[PDB]
Design an enzyme around this catalytic site. Structure first.
Site, PDB file in Angstrom:
ATOM      1  N   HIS A  21       0.799  -1.210   0.000  1.00  8.32           N
ATOM      2  CA  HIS A  21       0.000   0.000   0.000  1.00  8.32           C
ATOM      3  C   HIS A  21       0.846   1.281   0.000  1.00  8.32           C
ATOM      4  CE1 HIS A  21      -3.158  -2.944   1.218  1.00  8.32           C
ATOM      5  NE2 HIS A  21      -3.706  -2.352   0.180  1.00  8.32           N
ATOM      6  N   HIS A  56       1.591   1.217  -5.778  1.00  8.69           N
ATOM      7  CA  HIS A  56       0.224   0.701  -5.904  1.00  8.69           C
ATOM      8  C   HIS A  56      -0.767   1.733  -6.400  1.00  8.69           C
ATOM      9  CE1 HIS A  56      -3.538  -1.355  -5.177  1.00  8.69           C
ATOM     10  NE2 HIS A  56      -3.879  -0.479  -4.239  1.00  8.69           N
ATOM     11  N   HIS A 113      -6.596   6.773  -3.514  1.00 11.07           N
ATOM     12  CA  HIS A 113      -7.503   5.831  -2.826  1.00 11.07           C
ATOM     13  C   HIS A 113      -6.897   5.080  -1.645  1.00 11.07           C
ATOM     14  CE1 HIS A 113      -5.529   2.555  -5.006  1.00 11.07           C
ATOM     15  NE2 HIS A 113      -6.207   1.742  -4.220  1.00 11.07           N
ATOM     16  N   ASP A 114      -5.565   5.126  -1.514  1.00 10.38           N
ATOM     17  CA  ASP A 114      -4.892   4.419  -0.416  1.00 10.38           C
ATOM     18  C   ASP A 114      -3.896   5.336   0.307  1.00 10.38           C
ATOM     19  OD1 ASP A 114      -5.969   1.805  -0.149  1.00 10.38           O
ATOM     20  OD2 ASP A 114      -4.658   0.960  -1.720  1.00 10.38           O
ATOM     21  N   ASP A 126      -8.218  -1.581  -8.734  1.00  8.08           N
ATOM     22  CA  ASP A 126      -7.653  -1.855  -7.424  1.00  8.08           C
ATOM     23  C   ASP A 126      -7.313  -3.341  -7.323  1.00  8.08           C
ATOM     24  OD1 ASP A 126      -6.797  -1.214  -4.841  1.00  8.08           O
ATOM     25  OD2 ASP A 126      -8.774  -1.235  -3.922  1.00  8.08           O
ATOM     26  N   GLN A 155      -3.327 -16.897  -3.245  1.00  7.25           N
ATOM     27  CA  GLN A 155      -3.656 -16.343  -4.560  1.00  7.25           C
ATOM     28  C   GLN A 155      -4.726 -17.142  -5.316  1.00  7.25           C
ATOM     29  OE1 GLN A 155      -2.546 -13.178  -5.147  1.00  7.25           O
ATOM     30  NE2 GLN A 155      -2.195 -13.733  -2.988  1.00  7.25           N
ATOM     31  N   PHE A 170      -7.925 -16.085  -3.477  1.00  6.38           N
ATOM     32  CA  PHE A 170      -8.231 -14.715  -3.881  1.00  6.38           C
ATOM     33  C   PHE A 170      -8.794 -14.663  -5.291  1.00  6.38           C
ATOM     34  CE2 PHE A 170      -6.346 -10.468  -5.282  1.00  6.38           C
ATOM     35  CZ  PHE A 170      -7.278  -9.721  -4.613  1.00  6.38           C
TER      36      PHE A 170
END
Ligand SMILES: COc1cccc(Nc2c(C(N)=O)cnc3ccc(S(C)(=O)=O)cc23)c1
Ligand SMILES: COc1cccc(Nc2c(C(N)=O)cnc3ccc(S(C)(=O)=O)cc23)c1
Ligand SMILES: [As]
Ligand SMILES: [As]
Ligand SMILES: [As]
Ligand SMILES: [As]
Ligand SMILES: [As]
Ligand SMILES: [As]
Ligand SMILES: [Mg+2]
Ligand SMILES: [Mg+2]
Ligand SMILES: [Zn+2]
Ligand SMILES: [Zn+2]
EC number: 3.1.4.53
Lengths: 335, 335
Positions: free
Chosen positions: B82, B86, B122-123, B240, B291, B294
């Protein structure tokens, strides 16, 4: 610009700290804290405005800020001492020394500009290890610079290379001759910050102080360029070596940093199977003795000679240093 | 600006990488490397110029760069995933999705502006731990935001607070109504990036795709604001969550980062005597299974629904994802 962050309180706190801009007692740690860790950008902006240098040299505020932000970004925040807070401090300290009464009216605006710029760039992109570590490890920098003032040549190269881009060229509106003279002075000043040159610099300074000619009003007569750049090179050197002359609260914080940096170099040396540099060895070196030694052998002889040159301007500086020396000594458990 | 550093080679290398600006296959790690770790500032500058947004919205290049540099500085470089790389990636990815043929002519310039700005902010100021970690530890942020979308409200607050200073207000020349509409869209988009909202967002997206009305030319008809902001919120969400849809070389590098960040949170939890979050436990969690899970449970259902919405635009994206899923699976030693 009044702040670099999202805290509205900081705007006022920052301006509050900056009331002390022209004072030896400014607290740069506070400036960093209230500027979102932009002490070099902010202090440089404050200093140039204080001295009307953006107007005098037709420097765009926008360009100034961009260049300073990027220069500050080329100091390593993971290097404990040789980071932008050190550069900020040395720049603010040079700002104060430039106004010492004994040098009133002595320096041109271009010379003042040179000295503050040199201070700002003088350690940029420092990797947090010494020249000798770079030489001994056959580093890229030592190979580039043929083992001679390796870091100091590098700091200059970076600071000047950053001016090459139009959107960062703060010297654009200087004339060709001005730029050439500024470059010569800054190169001189930055190279003079290499500790391997200290003994010779001091010797030559003591020499100039021996035959100094203080005019009627109490101002040093420094007639030619050679005499002016010698005072300037020693001034930036003094500023660089000013930590032990600050309030004890500030000095102690600087010591924490330089020791962290030294001891990390020692760990690298151990790691590489190299011989440990004694002042860098965390397992054996005394922090307190290191400061007593540094002051007795390096900082006091320099500052005494400086004080002598500008008397009586530096008397409170000398007393503080002497007070701080005594604090560290008293912290050594043995007599 | 053509470079942020002292390397002249980088100028050309950087421009070379940026030839791929409009492509899914852009390599942001390279952009960072050739921009002196300014991937967010550079990619944002490239995107706005590509889309003629500084001209359209009368944004000063100088102000733009200052704001972007400072926003980038509010990403933590010590947070493994983050961080600003990113943000850069999500902004560049949103840039590409905005040009998907199925949405040609659908969005206003203000909406395009909103979406790219939302991605960039956004982060921002992410501390590298989850909402639940902040809530469970009674952090200042959780107390400020009453445990609801804690990080996402914070990212918005920082991004908007940075515009308050005149020298950073990139929206100065928008009209009051424009600014108000932009603020509403960005708030919507950023809040939609909270993973706790994913299931409901997807459900509502599947719903819109169910009854989508593709016009003769092959362009989605999205008539009212409510339909447009719903596509936009899902677009930024997709961007994202785009890592697993990139080339395997890129995806693997993202995985290294997110795992480093997760496992560091787990170490903090251990340190504090808290219950270890299973996906954060370095001693037990499988990177490869994480992963596969996810993708199977989150990324594939989202991207399949997106592809369905913009067909056939996202087919190569789906195949890559499916290829990458298969690579991670094959890396799990058990069937
Ligand atoms: C000018 O270049 C350098 C390099 C490293 C430290 C210093 N300054 C020292 C500081 C400081 N607070 O400024 C404190 N302690 C020191 C101890 C030893 C030395 S040295 C390596 O002997 O020059 C130096 C220092 C200066
Ligand atoms: C949108 O907010 C977040 C927060 C943390 C990770 C992610 N993305 C994940 C990535 C990535 N490369 O994007 C990879 N692996 C993940 C595994 C689990 C999760 S989670 C915490 O279950 O949402 C998330 C991820 C997204
Ligand atoms: As300032
Ligand atoms: As520049
Ligand atoms: As040492
Ligand atoms: As750029
Ligand atoms: As600003
Ligand atoms: As976790
Ligand atoms: Mg130095
Ligand atoms: Mg997020
Ligand atoms: Zn220094
Ligand atoms: Zn994100």
């Amino acid at each position: 610009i009044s702040r670099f962050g999202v805290n509205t309180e900081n705007e006022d706190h920052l301006a509050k700290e900056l009331e002390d801009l022209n004072k030896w007692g400014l607290n740069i740690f506070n400036v960093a804290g209230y500027s979102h860790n932009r002490p070099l950008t902010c202090i440089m902006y404050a200093i140039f405005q204080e001295r009307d240098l953006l107007k005098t040299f037709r420097i765009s505020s926008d360009t100034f800020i961009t260049y300073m932000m990027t220069l500050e970004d080329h100091y390593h925040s993971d290097v404990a001492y040789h980071n932008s807070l050190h550069a900020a401090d040395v720049a603010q300290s040079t700002h104060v020394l430039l106004s010492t009464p004994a040098l009133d009216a002595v320096f041109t605006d271009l010379e003042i500009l040179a000295a503050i710029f040199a201070a700002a760039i003088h350690d940029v992109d420092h990797p947090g290890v010494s020249n000798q570590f770079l030489i001994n490890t056959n580093s890229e920098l030592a190979l580039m610079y043929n083992d001679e003032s390796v870091l100091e040549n590098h700091h200059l190269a970076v600071g000047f290379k950053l001016l090459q881009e139009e959107h960062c060229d703060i010297f654009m509106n200087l004339t060709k001759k001005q730029r050439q003279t500024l470059r010569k002075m800054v190169i001189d000043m930055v190279l003079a910050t290499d500790m391997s040159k200290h003994m010779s610099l001091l010797a030559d300074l003591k020499t100039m102080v021996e035959t100094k000619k203080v005019t009627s009003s109490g101002v040093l007569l420094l007639d030619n360029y050679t005499d002016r750049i010698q005072v300037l090179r020693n001034m930036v050197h003094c500023a660089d070596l000013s930590n032990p002359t600050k309030s004890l609260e500030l000095y102690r914080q600087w010591t924490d940093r330089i020791m962290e940096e030294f001891f990390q170099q020692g760990d690298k040396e151990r790691e590489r199977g190299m011989e440990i540099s004694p002042m860098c060895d965390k397992h054996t070196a005394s922090v307190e003795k290191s400061q007593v030694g540094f002051i007795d052998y390096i900082v006091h002889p320099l500052w005494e000679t400086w004080a002598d040159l500008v008397q009586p301007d530096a008397q409170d500086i000398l007393d503080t240093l002497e007070d701080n020396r005594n604090w560290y000594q008293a912290m050594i458990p043995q007599a």
